């Protein structure tokens, strides 16, 4: 009976507690814009100040910051709760509140919004959880590896029995306005590339010129295009560059323009390109079983693509219940040597 | 450690009295060993890679990894990694009235990565719906591309490309080391030990890592081991533990 | 014996157990010293005659 | 910028708008909707959370007098509180556990002088334990406190 | 103003290539953003001296600084030994409408942030917003009109 | 310098990996002492000076 | 060739606002002056390994 | 600045040892405000403004 229940009992690490706090994350799809992610942040802040106003005290919302990394499409919201005392019940603890909210936000119009709890010891992991690096083990490049990664996901979906929520941690590639300077035409017309590239870069990129003092504090000085002339592909031709002729040349007189995809967050693992993948083992089945499967799916990826476990899923080959084995044997030795015997121990040890 | 500190704390004094030429490059402060722990050698089995190609392969896909592998001090590459090697002919340079000065300028000009901001950048005009990066010039990636670098347009409209004044190719950054394994072209990592560490457990890390990379090798590349010091250790332990059971029988 | 072993469950988790055990074994090392000074001498000079 | 050769001037203000504004404009923060800013603070490897958080609110108190009228500090997300109350709700549970030991030596002994050789014994080896956790260099934490309780 | 790949191939990879010979290093990992920012994380074996690791990393980082673009240099590169989770977030608002968001946030950066970020036990300070800079907002029409570039 | 000793100009990306770019004289033209006379430098009046 | 305000505003401030995440520091102080030099001195806790 | 405060220019080797090379003005030409009038500076013209 004791040997039965033992084997039919789950094995967590430390219980996730209610800490007075929690966080919500907002990721909008790439292309998104600051003002559009603020819409989503409002509807987040709203839910918590109207619907869960018995439990919430403060929402501190940040557009632009993200748990992920910075960018104009991400956000986060820090959420403070009333005292434990002032919210009795289990449906008034983080566990519930995060669930309700996450469900609630599930129908936010095109933006991943996910309320979740602080997990005991963050670096140590989510119990059923794994963290997986796919890798350009030699030469391939972003595109060939995006594909390798797709293959892997697509096929881990085809085992819902063993894996769940296998997903990239990174970002999908998005359109990008490529501009060629035609070197001949420039060098023909009398414009250096130095002035070309400086003009483009300063206007649209911004540029740190030098320091100055504001109320006795040294602070940076920046030059950049007023927002109006820096919003659209067309605005490129607003900008002129002076040749040695003395003559202001249009940008459009030495330059093509075209849309191209590329990554907005290139990630890398031990020195070479990578793509991080997160997921959990399926309910019932354990993580070493999901990890085993993920390695196996991994095995059948194309040439030049490898993998590595990292974070919570990095090396646990340590601890062991072999030191449970020593324990009762050294308990034995000392009951024996107390009772001057070798049958009198088995009396108590049992 | 607390002696790298102190050394680095005293090198700060000298730091600025050294020429700016020196202060580019940099000054290392490594806890150094001397002898090599081992030498891993790489060779090619089927003629699909030269001595210079192998070297560049080793540097570009093995040395970095191993120089961070658990235990290792300095690594020494027996050969060099590729560089874009513009080999300029002084005569053809005269023919068009050009100098290495013109060549370097062109190279800085046209092989360059340039930051060009973005559409819909912050601060925006309210109502903006799109935001995307503006990409401009990128670094060149190929010998053809460096060949086509414009140096000057001649009077007749005809152009002086870079391939007109120079031979362009992958080559090493230096051509100083050249290594050979039983007479056969090789490269290799000459691994040093990191100032006290389990040389035995280090070499099994180096070797375990090398296996992680083995399946991604190109056809024909084969790791070989011309100089391990750790087998002597492994055996010398057996031959004193051999005594242990000898003596306890006698 | 029943405790000190878990004070060497090392790596990752180790220090969670190392903290717990060393606490409980230090607490027993002090328990005997209490049972070999204060619990006896006090019994003598506190609990009523019988 | 230039002197137009006719005599005129091109001042910088005639080719650009000029204002103080952010180094950056990516990040924007509200607090229950109201425009705000703040400092997100991450703790240094190995530093103590509770000490560091006090250090901060000391230094912040150093600053409040000199703020400019209208400015107010607000406390939207704090890790420390729970770490501090977690420990205290245990250290309560440890005194309660003495108070329920004491009262089950009265359905079991009945001399007030004798129901005291136990109820003293516990506290004297606890407070000694703390001294040893101090010797080995441990801290008072949720595992060492649950040590004492057990 | 640099895009992801530009960051990767001019800051990230040059830095990565010089992380050599750094004791008890388990793994290394890095992001290069569309936002022109790179952060590389070196994670060390447990109970590693975090002060020594930093020194050791910063050492190798220093040998690579000369090779980063002036602009990345001029913005200030940093190496911190932090905890990745926010210990807390200190908020700041304005009661009486005398300070805008931009202004509140500048005040923080330029009166609070530095003090806080020297208070020992504080690995990283994230400012939710920006310090002021002098802004020149070029008009391209007005610029061209007077026959000028940036 | 660039001719007999080489010169690291800037970087490029070879198969996904930043590496160095060098200019230098071809071998033929930096082997003998006499070879110094092969190079011409160009005065500011537009003509090539040996 | 510099004067206290030159020295303070180009060198002293820039360093100061840049001494962060240094452990166990009590306070720090600067004397930007008109010999054209500065010294900044950070003082640590008793016990700090210097 | 060079005249009246002095420039550090670069190094040289005196007797097997590396040492600085400043250029100031000769003391006599940088004592009092009337001394300013002594100094002149080339224009586009290529004349010498004061």
mmCIF file of N, CA and C in Angstrom, chain A residues 279-321:
data_model
loop_
_atom_site.group_PDB
_atom_site.id
_atom_site.type_symbol
_atom_site.label_atom_id
_atom_site.label_comp_id
_atom_site.label_asym_id
_atom_site.label_seq_id
_atom_site.Cartn_x
_atom_site.Cartn_y
_atom_site.Cartn_z
ATOM 1 N N UNK A 279 8.719 24.301 -24.411
ATOM 2 C CA UNK A 279 7.550 23.433 -24.406
ATOM 3 C C UNK A 279 7.502 22.636 -23.129
ATOM 4 N N UNK A 280 6.394 21.920 -22.932
ATOM 5 C CA UNK A 280 6.263 20.981 -21.812
ATOM 6 C C UNK A 280 5.943 19.566 -22.273
ATOM 7 N N UNK A 281 6.252 18.647 -21.373
ATOM 8 C CA UNK A 281 5.764 17.297 -21.469
ATOM 9 C C UNK A 281 4.256 17.299 -21.327
ATOM 10 N N UNK A 282 3.626 16.328 -21.980
ATOM 11 C CA UNK A 282 2.171 16.176 -21.965
ATOM 12 C C UNK A 282 1.678 15.713 -20.588
ATOM 13 N N UNK A 283 0.416 16.072 -20.231
ATOM 14 C CA UNK A 283 -0.072 15.757 -18.886
ATOM 15 C C UNK A 283 -0.019 14.255 -18.669
ATOM 16 N N UNK A 284 0.578 13.832 -17.556
ATOM 17 C CA UNK A 284 0.826 12.416 -17.284
ATOM 18 C C UNK A 284 2.260 12.027 -17.580
ATOM 19 N N UNK A 285 2.627 12.067 -18.864
ATOM 20 C CA UNK A 285 3.992 11.727 -19.333
ATOM 21 C C UNK A 285 4.990 12.709 -18.720
ATOM 22 N N UNK A 286 6.206 12.255 -18.423
ATOM 23 C CA UNK A 286 7.231 13.118 -17.789
ATOM 24 C C UNK A 286 8.108 13.912 -18.797
ATOM 25 N N UNK A 287 9.040 14.704 -18.267
ATOM 26 C CA UNK A 287 9.810 15.639 -19.095
ATOM 27 C C UNK A 287 10.931 14.897 -19.824
ATOM 28 N N UNK A 288 11.619 14.007 -19.114
ATOM 29 C CA UNK A 288 12.653 13.149 -19.712
ATOM 30 C C UNK A 288 12.114 12.315 -20.854
ATOM 31 N N UNK A 289 10.822 12.014 -20.814
ATOM 32 C CA UNK A 289 10.156 11.391 -21.934
ATOM 33 C C UNK A 289 9.937 12.368 -23.092
ATOM 34 N N UNK A 290 9.499 13.595 -22.807
ATOM 35 C CA UNK A 290 9.365 14.657 -23.849
ATOM 36 C C UNK A 290 10.723 15.081 -24.428
ATOM 37 N N UNK A 291 11.709 15.245 -23.548
ATOM 38 C CA UNK A 291 13.086 15.537 -23.949
ATOM 39 C C UNK A 291 13.654 14.437 -24.883
ATOM 40 N N UNK A 292 13.459 13.170 -24.497
ATOM 41 C CA UNK A 292 13.826 11.994 -25.311
ATOM 42 C C UNK A 292 13.211 12.050 -26.705
ATOM 43 N N UNK A 293 11.937 12.431 -26.753
ATOM 44 C CA UNK A 293 11.215 12.532 -28.012
ATOM 45 C C UNK A 293 11.727 13.697 -28.848
ATOM 46 N N UNK A 294 11.842 14.855 -28.205
ATOM 47 C CA UNK A 294 12.370 16.057 -28.857
ATOM 48 C C UNK A 294 13.764 15.862 -29.455
ATOM 49 N N UNK A 295 14.634 15.131 -28.749
ATOM 50 C CA UNK A 295 15.963 14.719 -29.265
ATOM 51 C C UNK A 295 15.803 13.836 -30.492
ATOM 52 N N UNK A 296 14.826 12.930 -30.427
ATOM 53 C CA UNK A 296 14.538 12.023 -31.527
ATOM 54 C C UNK A 296 14.003 12.790 -32.748
ATOM 55 N N UNK A 297 12.944 13.583 -32.594
ATOM 56 C CA UNK A 297 12.532 14.477 -33.688
ATOM 57 C C UNK A 297 13.758 15.233 -34.216
ATOM 58 N N UNK A 298 14.557 15.755 -33.277
ATOM 59 C CA UNK A 298 15.767 16.510 -33.605
ATOM 60 C C UNK A 298 16.709 15.746 -34.530
ATOM 61 N N UNK A 299 17.004 14.505 -34.145
ATOM 62 C CA UNK A 299 17.763 13.562 -34.985
ATOM 63 C C UNK A 299 17.444 13.612 -36.502
ATOM 64 N N UNK A 300 16.160 13.763 -36.865
ATOM 65 C CA UNK A 300 15.718 13.735 -38.284
ATOM 66 C C UNK A 300 15.591 15.117 -38.965
ATOM 67 N N UNK A 301 16.276 16.136 -38.425
ATOM 68 C CA UNK A 301 16.330 17.467 -39.040
ATOM 69 C C UNK A 301 17.367 17.497 -40.140
ATOM 70 N N UNK A 302 17.349 18.530 -41.018
ATOM 71 C CA UNK A 302 18.291 18.506 -42.152
ATOM 72 C C UNK A 302 19.727 18.695 -41.771
ATOM 73 N N UNK A 303 20.586 18.559 -42.763
ATOM 74 C CA UNK A 303 22.043 18.661 -42.584
ATOM 75 C C UNK A 303 22.498 19.994 -42.027
ATOM 76 N N UNK A 304 23.427 19.935 -41.084
ATOM 77 C CA UNK A 304 23.989 21.145 -40.484
ATOM 78 C C UNK A 304 23.215 21.717 -39.316
ATOM 79 N N UNK A 305 22.124 21.077 -38.935
ATOM 80 C CA UNK A 305 21.353 21.551 -37.821
ATOM 81 C C UNK A 305 21.539 20.627 -36.648
ATOM 82 N N UNK A 306 21.935 21.185 -35.517
ATOM 83 C CA UNK A 306 22.068 20.439 -34.286
ATOM 84 C C UNK A 306 21.119 20.960 -33.227
ATOM 85 N N UNK A 307 21.339 20.499 -31.971
ATOM 86 C CA UNK A 307 20.564 20.942 -30.802
ATOM 87 C C UNK A 307 21.376 20.928 -29.548
ATOM 88 N N UNK A 308 20.852 21.537 -28.501
ATOM 89 C CA UNK A 308 21.491 21.615 -27.184
ATOM 90 C C UNK A 308 20.386 21.919 -26.176
ATOM 91 N N UNK A 309 20.453 21.285 -25.016
ATOM 92 C CA UNK A 309 19.574 21.597 -23.905
ATOM 93 C C UNK A 309 20.263 22.668 -23.105
ATOM 94 N N UNK A 310 19.479 23.533 -22.462
ATOM 95 C CA UNK A 310 19.998 24.707 -21.781
ATOM 96 C C UNK A 310 19.002 25.252 -20.778
ATOM 97 N N UNK A 311 19.481 25.926 -19.745
ATOM 98 C CA UNK A 311 18.588 26.451 -18.697
ATOM 99 C C UNK A 311 18.134 25.357 -17.755
ATOM 100 N N UNK A 312 16.843 25.350 -17.414
ATOM 101 C CA UNK A 312 16.248 24.263 -16.595
ATOM 102 C C UNK A 312 16.522 22.891 -17.197
ATOM 103 N N UNK A 313 16.528 22.779 -18.517
ATOM 104 C CA UNK A 313 16.779 21.488 -19.152
ATOM 105 C C UNK A 313 18.265 21.107 -19.281
ATOM 106 N N UNK A 314 19.193 21.949 -18.797
ATOM 107 C CA UNK A 314 20.630 21.618 -18.805
ATOM 108 C C UNK A 314 21.019 20.705 -17.663
ATOM 109 N N UNK A 315 21.714 19.607 -17.999
ATOM 110 C CA UNK A 315 22.321 18.633 -17.038
ATOM 111 C C UNK A 315 21.745 18.586 -15.590
ATOM 112 N N UNK A 316 21.021 17.507 -15.271
ATOM 113 C CA UNK A 316 20.604 17.204 -13.887
ATOM 114 C C UNK A 316 21.288 15.935 -13.331
ATOM 115 N N UNK A 317 22.317 15.404 -14.015
ATOM 116 C CA UNK A 317 23.009 14.145 -13.606
ATOM 117 C C UNK A 317 23.741 14.258 -12.242
ATOM 118 N N UNK A 318 22.951 14.422 -11.178
ATOM 119 C CA UNK A 318 23.429 14.733 -9.818
ATOM 120 C C UNK A 318 22.246 14.767 -8.823
ATOM 121 N N UNK A 319 22.542 14.410 -7.572
ATOM 122 C CA UNK A 319 21.539 14.226 -6.525
ATOM 123 C C UNK A 319 21.450 12.753 -6.192
ATOM 124 N N UNK A 320 20.537 12.067 -6.882
ATOM 125 C CA UNK A 320 20.371 10.606 -6.822
ATOM 126 C C UNK A 320 19.760 10.086 -5.502
ATOM 127 N N UNK A 321 18.886 9.048 -5.587
ATOM 128 C CA UNK A 321 18.515 8.274 -4.385
ATOM 129 C C UNK A 321 19.474 7.093 -4.035
#
